[PDB]
Scaffold this active site. Structure first.
Site, PDB file in Angstrom:
ATOM      1  N   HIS F  80      27.491  33.531  35.430  1.00  0.00           N
ATOM      2  CA  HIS F  80      27.196  33.606  36.855  1.00  0.00           C
ATOM      3  C   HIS F  80      25.683  33.722  37.056  1.00  0.00           C
ATOM      4  O   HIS F  80      25.186  33.608  38.175  1.00  0.00           O
ATOM      5  CB  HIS F  80      27.892  34.818  37.474  1.00  0.00           C
ATOM      6  CG  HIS F  80      28.240  34.618  38.919  1.00  0.00           C
ATOM      7  ND1 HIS F  80      29.223  35.362  39.548  1.00  0.00           N
ATOM      8  CD2 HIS F  80      27.791  33.732  39.821  1.00  0.00           C
ATOM      9  CE1 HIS F  80      29.360  34.918  40.784  1.00  0.00           C
ATOM     10  NE2 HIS F  80      28.510  33.933  40.983  1.00  0.00           N
ATOM     11  N   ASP F 102      34.024  37.411  44.033  1.00  0.00           N
ATOM     12  CA  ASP F 102      34.009  37.861  42.658  1.00  0.00           C
ATOM     13  C   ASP F 102      34.739  39.187  42.498  1.00  0.00           C
ATOM     14  O   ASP F 102      34.815  39.975  43.441  1.00  0.00           O
ATOM     15  CB  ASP F 102      32.539  38.081  42.331  1.00  0.00           C
ATOM     16  CG  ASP F 102      32.233  38.020  40.875  1.00  0.00           C
ATOM     17  OD1 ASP F 102      32.938  38.655  40.062  1.00  0.00           O
ATOM     18  OD2 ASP F 102      31.238  37.332  40.568  1.00  0.00           O
ATOM     19  N   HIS F 104      33.599  41.270  40.538  1.00  0.00           N
ATOM     20  CA  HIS F 104      32.448  42.149  40.329  1.00  0.00           C
ATOM     21  C   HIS F 104      31.380  41.871  41.377  1.00  0.00           C
ATOM     22  O   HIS F 104      31.429  40.849  42.059  1.00  0.00           O
ATOM     23  CB  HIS F 104      31.859  41.939  38.932  1.00  0.00           C
ATOM     24  CG  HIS F 104      32.864  42.062  37.834  1.00  0.00           C
ATOM     25  ND1 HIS F 104      33.600  40.992  37.372  1.00  0.00           N
ATOM     26  CD2 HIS F 104      33.299  43.144  37.139  1.00  0.00           C
ATOM     27  CE1 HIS F 104      34.446  41.405  36.441  1.00  0.00           C
ATOM     28  NE2 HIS F 104      34.281  42.709  36.284  1.00  0.00           N
ATOM     29  N   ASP F 106      27.961  42.006  40.568  1.00  0.00           N
ATOM     30  CA  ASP F 106      26.794  41.439  39.892  1.00  0.00           C
ATOM     31  C   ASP F 106      25.521  41.933  40.570  1.00  0.00           C
ATOM     32  O   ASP F 106      24.564  41.171  40.745  1.00  0.00           O
ATOM     33  CB  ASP F 106      26.822  39.908  39.942  1.00  0.00           C
ATOM     34  CG  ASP F 106      28.015  39.322  39.216  1.00  0.00           C
ATOM     35  OD1 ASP F 106      28.375  39.843  38.140  1.00  0.00           O
ATOM     36  OD2 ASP F 106      28.582  38.331  39.714  1.00  0.00           O
ATOM     37  N   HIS F 118      23.970  38.264  33.376  1.00  0.00           N
ATOM     38  CA  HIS F 118      24.993  37.717  34.257  1.00  0.00           C
ATOM     39  C   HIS F 118      25.671  38.795  35.097  1.00  0.00           C
ATOM     40  O   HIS F 118      26.592  38.516  35.867  1.00  0.00           O
ATOM     41  CB  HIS F 118      26.020  36.892  33.464  1.00  0.00           C
ATOM     42  CG  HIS F 118      26.606  37.599  32.281  1.00  0.00           C
ATOM     43  ND1 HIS F 118      27.437  38.692  32.400  1.00  0.00           N
ATOM     44  CD2 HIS F 118      26.537  37.322  30.955  1.00  0.00           C
ATOM     45  CE1 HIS F 118      27.858  39.055  31.200  1.00  0.00           C
ATOM     46  NE2 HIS F 118      27.328  38.239  30.307  1.00  0.00           N
ATOM     47  N   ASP F 200      33.481  33.091  41.577  1.00  0.00           N
ATOM     48  CA  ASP F 200      33.686  33.510  40.201  1.00  0.00           C
ATOM     49  C   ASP F 200      35.195  33.461  39.985  1.00  0.00           C
ATOM     50  O   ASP F 200      35.952  34.063  40.743  1.00  0.00           O
ATOM     51  CB  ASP F 200      33.186  34.942  39.991  1.00  0.00           C
ATOM     52  CG  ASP F 200      33.217  35.356  38.536  1.00  0.00           C
ATOM     53  OD1 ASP F 200      34.231  35.089  37.864  1.00  0.00           O
ATOM     54  OD2 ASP F 200      32.232  35.955  38.058  1.00  0.00           O
ATOM     55  N   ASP F 202      37.060  34.954  38.085  1.00  0.00           N
ATOM     56  CA  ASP F 202      37.711  36.238  37.890  1.00  0.00           C
ATOM     57  C   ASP F 202      38.130  36.969  39.155  1.00  0.00           C
ATOM     58  O   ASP F 202      38.704  38.041  39.066  1.00  0.00           O
ATOM     59  CB  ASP F 202      36.856  37.164  37.015  1.00  0.00           C
ATOM     60  CG  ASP F 202      35.642  37.718  37.737  1.00  0.00           C
ATOM     61  OD1 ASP F 202      35.522  37.582  38.969  1.00  0.00           O
ATOM     62  OD2 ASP F 202      34.798  38.317  37.049  1.00  0.00           O
ATOM     63  N   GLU F 245      32.123  31.074  35.660  1.00  0.00           N
ATOM     64  CA  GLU F 245      32.873  31.919  34.739  1.00  0.00           C
ATOM     65  C   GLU F 245      34.205  31.391  34.192  1.00  0.00           C
ATOM     66  O   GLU F 245      35.031  32.165  33.707  1.00  0.00           O
ATOM     67  CB  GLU F 245      33.065  33.298  35.378  1.00  0.00           C
ATOM     68  CG  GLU F 245      31.753  34.064  35.634  1.00  0.00           C
ATOM     69  CD  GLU F 245      31.142  34.654  34.363  1.00  0.00           C
ATOM     70  OE1 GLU F 245      31.903  35.172  33.524  1.00  0.00           O
ATOM     71  OE2 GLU F 245      29.902  34.617  34.206  1.00  0.00           O
TER      72      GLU F 245
HETATM   73 MN   LIG Z   1      30.214  37.160  38.749  1.00  0.00          MN
HETATM   74 MN   LIG Z   2      32.741  38.385  37.866  1.00  0.00          MN
END
Ligand SMILES: [Mn+2]
Ligand SMILES: [Mn+2]
Ligand SMILES: N[C@@H](CCCC[NH3+])C(=O)O
Ligand SMILES: N[C@@H](CCCC[NH3+])C(=O)O
Ligand SMILES: N[C@@H](CCCC[NH3+])C(=O)O
Ligand SMILES: N[C@@H](CCCC[NH3+])C(=O)O
Ligand SMILES: N[C@@H](CCCC[NH3+])C(=O)O
Ligand SMILES: N[C@@H](CCCC[NH3+])C(=O)O
Ligand SMILES: [Mn+2]
Ligand SMILES: [Mn+2]
Ligand SMILES: [Mn+2]
Ligand SMILES: [Mn+2]
Ligand SMILES: [Mn+2]
Ligand SMILES: [Mn+2]
Ligand SMILES: [Mn+2]
Ligand SMILES: [Mn+2]
Ligand SMILES: [Mn+2]
Ligand SMILES: [Mn+2]
Lengths: 273, 273, 273, 273, 273, 273
Positions: F80, F102, F104, F106, F118, F200, F202, F245
């Site tokens: 990312h 995402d 997360h 980040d 990342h 992303d 994920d 990702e």
């Molecule tokens: Mn990310």
């Molecule tokens: Mn992520």
């Protein structure tokens, strides 16, 4: 959500009690609390006067039993004798717990005693006393009754109360245990039952509630009375209420009636927070 | 060892409060208690009056902040609005616990409400309210605030208090738990922090303290108020005090001012034994 | 005139620190200085070990709080974690200034960091960290704290220290300003307050005090440490002392313990002239 | 429980609308309904007149925003232009639904059109139009707006309304679906939001409300208007109201003002049963 | 701050549930969350088995009642029958709200039904059922109970639930209202009361929690279950928790146990942000 | 009408993501949708690797900035981290809103944390982090950033996000509000701005998208992700997209790459009706 108010101007100056309570804006304040309120007016009132008392209480019983369920009844009174009709009527044939907040036990029979009927309603409701009264008003088991604030009893009453096994919290227990603990014990003793609260103005200390026929020193403070009503309200099991023995002729600026109205509000959910 | 007394005759009849308190011999009695005392005189006082209030409270804040450390400040007031300046000033840029002993929460904002600023000081101090006030008076974290004796709240106040997470002991809790336990819980909740006590005369029952602008029945008794002050005093953490809302025009023989002076003495160490 | 010594052999080889300090004749030398000394023995000691540490520090706090006022307490230790209890206890509920003489700030929280509790005592005392600790050990205000001799900090610690507004004199300031000036500034920053001095052996240069768990080069010289103690002593405001982190297992001929005993004597008035 | 009435005699003969509405006893009737009412008087009023309109509407916005929460504002007006200030002010920075009951959409911009500002308030409120107006009055998302009773639109308006995605119930939909269904759909479309109702007298059929500047045949009947108000009232989400465009100079015996006052009462809870 | 974990390996393969939950690192993760945790080990376990169940549940009740207040108990189980003891014991004689998150209602009596006691605990706790159980385990009022996630009921159960007036949220209500709204309604319905959460693994969809004795399709999703726990956690009123019916013999890689451990963490404050 | 696809096989197995996405026929399907598509190939890729990452991201930024305006860029990635270059490049020096979808945030800095770059791209883009990165990649104001689907954050990240004032929609909010409302709020929060969407893989539940480096349970469903894309598409303001990702080495039958390709199609206008 719904509340019905009915008066019983029975004095057989307490017959002026219903008007005094109404003048203390019981109704307007119940609405501010969020309840939809209906005033049903007064029930016609015409040893001593047993039959006349029976007649009036019978009309009251029938008036309350007619109410659509879900409608909380508040009976404004003169004599505590009206409770023979209010409890029997409000019970709707079901088992209910009775919380009698009074300086007296009102547990006399014609045998135990001045022959005043307003000194025998709780006994009658428990099935003790003159047949003409018990036959139509017996409505609670002595074990489902709790007295709170008692500070004056006749010898005969003491015997009957013990014999019957009625839970009694005199001012001695109030001083010793505290209202918070007593209120808890009251709810436990009558657990799982809908509750009818009968509040006699004389339970309050005379310095606070002078407008009562039989004042007895050493009663509940303003705060203790409110706490008791608040804890009973928290249980969510209170289903009916009597506000009795207010006597404006002996009162000062209607403060005794105002007191009881405030207590009714607390019993119906009014809270500081 | 040292105490500084300053008055804020602000009423924007409570403006006569500082004189009433001085006339109740606060100063002479503090000296009898062993403190060396200095009277700093009064702070000049000239929606409603927000800028005038801000100006006066700012003078107060600066006066208290300039005091040498170790000098205990007692602010005598009219409006409780003065606390925006007293707490911010007495805090000395430091983290202080606030024990607000009042019948009201004074936690309103311009949005929640009659627009009276003296009904918003605790909110302001907590960082909620008009920018012109919070920008110079924000001084305490809502979590370091404890209200005691509350018995009257506005709908909006309730929301803000809950949102802010302020610990509130209404008279219901007082009746349920007792002052002794509440005082202990206050010290625990604010454990390790210096403490600022803001005492509004109306926390006392009106029958005991009639000289207040907004009397509310069912307040603290004489004994309870002293017990609270005594337990707080025992902690040794009390660092400042406000004695507000005394209104001699509504008082009787200056007894309300005398009440508060006695409470100040207890808070500063006076004990029976 | 009176001094009480208590040990806290806590290592949760610093647990041997109290014995090393006693063996360096701390007690005999205090008497030679004119003090009447009492050894109270040791406090029983049984993320990591938080509850065990809390228990021991609590016993310490209670032991110190129970001492008659006028008795100067000196706590001998293993882990600096004992200061949560020594400062809170020695404070006696009153506002005290803290002079933390250490190579580290011990201002970590569970969030900022290896999870060692002996790296978080000053933060806890300042009200930051695990609730189980702050709820019984929060005792000082951040602006009443001064770090002296610091030369090693974690990233998180720096943030917390700046946020809290703690006055920090790292070795950079020591080199730039000199101990004489710093001591003067410490006293000014904490003016009017009784002082608690917490002396971690590692503040001394490792070449001088090898007996420490976390040695850091570039520390205070023998003379600088004695000058600091002497100037703090002159103020006449020092009320309590911690002598911590002595580790005989890493020491050489017990010289680190002997160093700290000598510094304690200077803090308590020992002078060349 | 509380209602605040403010007038905006703006005509930039509708400027006589506030007086006509007051003369129709709006206030007395609100009190009979149980509300405590306060008349705040009138807001000073001095392409066409854009700056003068902006000034007046700004004063209005501020006046309403300053009201203690819990106070229901009813703005009496001349030009519907006042709504730029009433809606923005009554919204209090929060998301509110707008129910615009009007024969017109008032969704014009300076581009779409006779340059009358009172034909652009809803557009402005939605963020479309002259910068000098949108910068201080934009207050609602086009998707939280619902027009009811529309029967006259300009070509440009139709485009903007469709582009913006405003839900529009013209008289065609009223005839096809019926007010009961439309009222239900309005509440659904704006579910969970506090509602601001802007009532233009011209939504009513001219035969019923002649006192309007731009009458358009085929409007709502007396019964439909009351039904709409009653259903909206039942939701319990109505928080503010505008009663605009009443022009006594074109009216007959003030019946148009009387009509609107009756509708305000219905919106505030008045019911046959 | 303090958590006590106790297991009840009762299966009268769910008896392996406590070990499975411990193996899912419930304890280690609670500590990472900042709690100090103590494993009390397991309670000895030796129509069907009523007396044996009563004995074990009684030991559990006593063990929990004996815990110092302030210690949050988490009971790991086999049969949900253990809740007769966990709820009664954790209630500490006070009024507590019960949130039963289960695919079943466990509201059967010996009369309503296969005679399995683990299908009657909630009824017993409500005072309905075999005397030998209700005499020592009755501990909650039916009105203070809320069922969430129910999707399988016996005819008799439905009657008893309706008769008792227990608030029930089946998966139909979950689908219709959403967990967010239901969680809010649960808290409101049990407002002001400390809460005991009894979590049966089978409330989760079988595809997510196969390790349960009586799997029922159409259950809560992973996200819904966490949201429910998070909203209950935000109330700050949750005081105790049961993690029951985990059966590793029917599970896959212990994922059902891991699922419940994660939910317990959410209930005790674990949050994304 | 025009779309440019560029890959960044950066893994400093996600480096195989661009090929996986191309193999999922992203290009052929974009053409079926009516777009004229050009594959620009891949950008050369040779604490950890900061300079190498900077070099690659810089080539990417320049490549995108050089595209004729009107060409929609889709960047296929591994790490990312590539977003530092894609957002800065696609922004073309103008103010753009960033929708970061995402699991997360980040939002780490070298200070907040495993040193993986990342895990810091969004922070960098917001101007926080290593100077070598922010000097050439800072490109968005924290207030023009919205995170959606977050379910895993580091302690330091939480602080930075709150400090920066970034609007964050964690799965808790997703569950509480629903994607429909969140999508509407995202567009409102970033009203009037061209939008860059960084997706992303994920963010999708692991059960749906196993092919990701850091899977986190409780993610978005297939339908929720498509709904989010469709509502953003409707705004007509989306100008650029990152598909990052994707890790085929951890994937199953390339279904994660196929998932993201489908989401890109919805974001670019593909609709059921
Ligand atoms: Mn990310
Ligand atoms: Mn992520
Ligand atoms: N206000 C009452 C007086 C109380 C009379 C009770 N009978 C009435 O005059 O109607
Ligand atoms: N004795 C004082 C009275 C307090 C007055 C309130 N502003 C004086 O009048 O100087
Ligand atoms: N001299 C002490 C040693 C203390 C070091 C740590 N508990 C003893 O062995 O009795
Ligand atoms: N009655 C109003 C006339 C309408 C005024 C509108 N500004 C007056 O004479 O005060
Ligand atoms: N590990 C457990 C097994 C749980 C089996 C059920 N009683 C034990 O201690 O053997
Ligand atoms: N099939 C692509 C694979 C991408 C893996 C990332 N550097 C190639 O060899 O060109
Ligand atoms: Mn009586
Ligand atoms: Mn009586
Ligand atoms: Mn006040
Ligand atoms: Mn007050
Ligand atoms: Mn240290
Ligand atoms: Mn150190
Ligand atoms: Mn109009
Ligand atoms: Mn119109
Ligand atoms: Mn179950
Ligand atoms: Mn079950």
């Amino acid at each position: 959500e719904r509340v019905a108010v009915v008066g019983v101007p029975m004095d057989l100056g307490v017959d002026m009690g219903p008007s005094a309570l109404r003048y203390a804006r019981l109704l307007e304040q119940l609405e501010d609390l969020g309840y939809t309120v209906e005033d049903l007016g007064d029930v016609p009132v015409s040893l001593a006067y047993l039959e006349e008392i029976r007649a009036a209480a019978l009309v009251l019983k029938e008036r309350l039993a007619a109410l659509p369920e879900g409608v909380f009844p508040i009976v404004l009174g003169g004599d505590h004798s009206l409770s023979m009709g209010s409890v029997a009527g409000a019970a709707r044939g079901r088992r209910v717990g009775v919380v009698w907040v009074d300086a007296h036990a009102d547990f006399n029979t014609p045998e135990t005693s001045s022959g005043n009927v307003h000194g025998m309603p709780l006994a009658v409701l428990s099935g003790l006393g003159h047949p003409r009264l018990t036959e139509v008003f017996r409505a609670v088991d002595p074990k489902d009754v709790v007295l709170v604030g008692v500070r004056s009893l006749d010898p005969g009453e003491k015997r009957l109360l013990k014999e019957a096994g009625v839970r009694v919290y005199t001012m001695h227990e109030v001083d010793r245990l505290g209202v918070a603990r007593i209120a808890e014990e009251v709810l436990k003793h009558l657990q799982g039952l809908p509750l009818h609260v009968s509040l006699d103005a004389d339970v309050l200390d005379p310095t606070l509630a002078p407008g009562v026929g039989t004042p007895v020193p050493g009663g509940l403070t303003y705060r203790e009375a409110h706490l008791l009503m608040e804890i009973l309200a928290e249980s969510g099991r209170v289903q009916s209420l009597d506000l009795v023995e207010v006597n404006p002729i002996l009162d000062e600026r209607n403060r005794t009636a105002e007191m009881l109205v405030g207590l009714a509000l607390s019993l119906l959910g009014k809270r500081i927070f």
